Every structure is written in C-alpha cells, then in structure tokens.
Amino acid sequence: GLSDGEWQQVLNVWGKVEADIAGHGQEVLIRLFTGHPETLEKFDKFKHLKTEAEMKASEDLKKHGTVVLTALGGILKKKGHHEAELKPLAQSHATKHKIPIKYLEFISDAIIHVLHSKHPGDFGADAQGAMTKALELFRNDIAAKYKELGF
Numbered sequence: 153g154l155s156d157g158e159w160q161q162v163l164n165v166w167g168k169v170e171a172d173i174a175g176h177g178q179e180v181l182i183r184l185f186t187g188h189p190e191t192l193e194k195f196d197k198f199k200h201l202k203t204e205a206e207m208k209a210s211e212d213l214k215k216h217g218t219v220v221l222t223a224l225g226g227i228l229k230k231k232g233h234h235e236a237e238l239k240p241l242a243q244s245h246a247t248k249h250k251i252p253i254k255y256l257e258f259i260s261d262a263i264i265h266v267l268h269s270k271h272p273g274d275f276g277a278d279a280q281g282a283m284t285k286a287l288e289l290f291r292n293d294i295a296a297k298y299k300e301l302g303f
C-alpha cells in the first residue's frame with residue numbers, strides 16, 4: 153500500500169483538483185476521449201461529440217467530469233480503506249457499462265497528464281510518485297472485483 157507520507161502527498165495534490173473539480177473533470181475526459189476514441193463509444197450520451205470543440209462546449213461532459221472526480225476523491229480520502237466505495241463502481245463498470253480495465257489505465261494516465269498540464273512545475277516528482285501509487289491501488293482493487301465477475 154501507500155505510506156502515511158505518500159497518502160499525505162496524494163491528498164495534498166487532490167486539493168488542486170478540488171479548487172476546480174469541473175475543469176479538471178472536463179480535461180481528464182477530453183484527454184481520455186481524444187487519446188482513445190474507442191472510450192467515447194462506451195458513452196451513449198457523448199458519442200455525438202464529433203470534435204474536441206464540441207467536447208469543450210458540452211456542459212453535460214463537464215457535469216460527468218464532476219461526478220467522476222467526486223467519486224474518485226471520496227475513494228482517495230479513505231486511504232486504501234475503500235472496499236465499500238469501490239465495490240459498486242467495480243460492479244457498475246464491469247457489468248453495466250462494460251468498461252475494460254485497460255480503460256481505467258487510460259483514465260489514470262489522463263489524470264496524471266492533466267495534473268501536469270494544469271499545474272506545470274507544481275506537480276513534483278514525489279507527488280507524481282504518490283498519486284501514481286494511489287491510482288494503481290484503485291486500479292488493482294477494481295481489477296480484483298473484475299476477476300471475481302469474470303470480466
């Protein structure tokens with residue numbers, strides 16, 4: 153898992169996201185959809201978005217960005233004690249949304265990219281290390297639930 157020091161870094165970095173949850177959420181999703189168009193196809197409500205300009209101008213995309221990062225933030229603040237929070241997400245994403253674990257890798261990478269893009273020079277090597285460990289823990293615990301479901 154993560155050390156106390158590493159969790160402290162994770163939640164310090166997360167303060168950046170919390171100051172503009174919608175903007176961070178929007179950019180993470182645009183980074184995901186533009187880097188991996190196949191992911192857009194998993195959202196019936198976003199597949200109409202043909203261009204990044206349309207994505208940027210979509211208020212519903214920003215709304216979903218807020219939902220996604222709010223859920224993640226909740227999970228992170230549990231500092232690994234997140235079984236109850238993670239279980240329903242693993243289930244909905246495997247069974248209902250049919251999201252391969254690879255796409256969770258993509259969005260983890262997107263979060264790291266957006267943090268650098270929005271805070272260049274203010275996302276230090278230790279911070280990236282800790283946030284990356286937290287996102288891997290998230291992904292690893294989700295993967296365990298995916299395997300249970302055979303997904």
Ligand code: HEM
Pocket residue numbers: 191192194195196197219220221223224240241244245249251255256259
């Ligand atoms: C940090 C990783 C993620 C978090 C925290 C997250 C969180 C959520 C939450 C809270 C919801 C609404 C409740 C629910 O249906 O469970 C949701 C819905 C959804 N998620 Fe995710 N999600 C993540 C990753 C992804 C990825 C990578 C994809 C696809 C590439 C995806 C596809 C979807 C879809 C299609 C919905 C339903 C959207 C709708 O029609 O309203 N999710 N997600």
Ligand SMILES: O=N[O-]
Pocket residue numbers: 155156157158
């Ligand atoms: O937990 N301090 O590394």
Ligand SMILES: O=N[O-]
Pocket residue numbers: 181216220
């Ligand atoms: O954007 N993930 O639901």
Ligand SMILES: O=N[O-]
Pocket residue numbers: none
């Ligand atoms: O209505 N089920 O998302």
